[PDB]
């Protein structure tokens, strides 16, 4: 679906409302903003490979712009000039204080709020790569991913906001509908992730 069909469907299923059209757009943007703030991150918010170049003597690497969380089946990889690389390992900061002053290529990291820290402090310019989840407004794609894959969740959320203002009771029905849609979306993500994969112990 697209924005026009979304607005038309939201207006139709809210009681064939016709006067309001701008509030629907406002609460449709706010619905996506609210959904991005919750704990569950769908698969379509995963970014592409991004590389960072940094100066010598700074261990702090700022977090990417729309960082929500990192991707577990992924890693921060140091790409050496020759094209080879190693995967850096995450530990807590307390655990990485032994290394201050030991010298060499970077080998470990910690995330403290807005910054990634490379504790084996490089003495020369480096380059790292990362895969992580991002807010949509910052992805490079053509259309909001949400519109294509999560359209029915969005409709319900918008209808809930609008009705909630009117103080209607119907709102709790649409919140239950949205909760069911998100529950199904989680199972769909799990099924997509695990397809054609065989697990061996050890």
């Amino acid at each position: 679906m697209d924005k026009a069909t979304l607005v038309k469907t939201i207006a139709y299923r809210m009681g064939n409302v016709k006067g309001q059209d701008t509030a629907i757009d406002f609460e449709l943007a706010l619905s996506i903003e609210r959904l991005e703030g919750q704990e569950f991150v769908p698969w379509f918010l995963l970014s592409e490979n991004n590389f960072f170049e940094g100066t010598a003597q700074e261990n702090r690497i700022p977090v990417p712009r729309g960082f929500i969380r990192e991707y577990e089946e992924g890693s921060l990889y140091l790409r050496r000039v020759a094209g080879t690389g190693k995967c850096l390992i995450k530990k807590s900061q307390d655990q990485l204080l032994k290394y201050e002053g030991m010298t060499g290529e970077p080998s470990h990291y910690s995330l403290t709020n807005q910054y990634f820290r490379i504790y084996p402090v490089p003495q020369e310019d480096f380059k790292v790569e990362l895969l992580f989840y991002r807010k949509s407004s910052t992805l490079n794609v053509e259309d909001n991913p949400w519109y294509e894959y999560a359209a029915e969740l969005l409709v319900a959320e918008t209808i809930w906001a609008m009705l909630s203002a009117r103080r209607d009771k119907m709102a709790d029905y649409w919140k239950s509908v949205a909760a069911d849609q998100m529950r199904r979306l989680t199972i769909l993500d799990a099924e997509r992730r695990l397809a054609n994969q065989e697990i061996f112990m050890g």
Binding site: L194, E198, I199, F200, M201, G202
Partner: protein, 50 residues
């Protein structure tokens, strides 16, 4: 003179042997729907039947 007894012995042996043949093989009972099948049919040493 011993024939009548010998037979009792053959009967005992044969019965035992015929009952073992019928039931002593490892076999399992299960619900086909709940599992992915190709996984069940593998003899690899460590395998997770998903």
């Amino acid at each position: 003179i011993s024939a009548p007894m010998n037979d009792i012995l053959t009967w005992l042996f044969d019965s035992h042997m015929y009952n073992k043949r019928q039931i002593m093989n490892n076999q399992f009972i299960g619900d086909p729907s709940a599992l992915v099948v190709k996984d069940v049919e593998s003899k690899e040493p460590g395998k997770f039947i998903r």
